[model samples]
Target: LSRLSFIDVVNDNGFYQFEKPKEGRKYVATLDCSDYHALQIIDITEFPYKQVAVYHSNTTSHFILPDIVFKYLMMYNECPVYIELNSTGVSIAKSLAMDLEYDNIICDSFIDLGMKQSKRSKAMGCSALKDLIEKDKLIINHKGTIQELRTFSEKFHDDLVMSLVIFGWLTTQEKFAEYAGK
Candidate 1:
């Protein structure tokens, strides 16, 4: 709706934050909290899948501490928090939103309580992601991510791919609200 520009880049040793806005781009990020250290963050602005981050640890827990992670999110200007609503994530997502008094959170349709990934649904999502890339609607720069994409297959660990797929599905939101459900 407005012209987007990069204002500044702040780098503080272990932390660096920056933003470059593109006109009419809607910024949205995805959080995938799985049983593994596959917690992921994605920025789907402009629908290119260019910005992505994965949270992991060499610590005993194999993940980022909740306090620090949520703190990171706070410093991260609120877009919409889309978390994988499964395992410990269900409570964590809801709790974080509640604690922060933040709404606008989403998850792929939840059943009962735990999250479920249907192969059929995933295949559709993955196909959509593939098409987005093929059509130049998606562009990525992360080396590990590019590597992951190269090795992506249904039979293997597509955890990172899962986050990408979810962000890909969220493309119609925000910017496309008026054009949605068409």
Candidate 2:
């Protein structure tokens, strides 16, 4: 029997690439945008959803974040990005749309730039994420994401796991199948 091992692939400037972007895949990204805290990004594909790449940093400026975010977004075939509309998130989305010329940003009501993390959504995300992992329904590739999951207490620093939480919420949406390329 053979055992599997991860390569722990990471680039300078807080980027980690587990897999290269696959052509013709319907990819999506969840952003945990923040300023003083860590800004987390998770890119994935659905219809067998799984994490692909992750970018996490606490030192980077939000002003310059659009550049870095768009790099991965474009690398992944310009996937739709779902950002939580809180704190400095709106500005980040705006920069991506206007400056970076990146579209396909998910809106809360088809009016706002990004989705708002409501209390119910967070609650449901917690339950959904738990079930997804326990049932082997989701495949997590990134080491940081798994590490965060291991220590994801209610009071712990959950910047990385929050991206997964948003993803967990995404699967339950009514139109998620539309984005999953089914």
Using TM-score as the measure, the top candidate is 2
Per-residue lDDT of model 2, residues 1-182, tens digit only: 01212357765578877667767677778888772333333334454565667788788888998888888888888778888777688899889889988887877775567768589888887788787776766666666666667777653457777877777788778767676762
Q: After superposition, how far is residue 111 of candidate 2 from its true place, in Å?
A: 3.3
Q: Give the Cα-based TM-score of candidate 2 against the true structure.
A: 0.86
Cα lDDT tens digits for candidate 1, 114-163: 23455554566677777776776655533444556767774535555666
Model 1 steric clash total: 0
lDDT of each: 0.49, 0.71
- Candidate 2 residues lying further than 4 Å off, grouped into runs, are 1-7, 35-46, 154-156
Clash pairs for candidate 2: none
TM per prediction: 0.63, 0.86
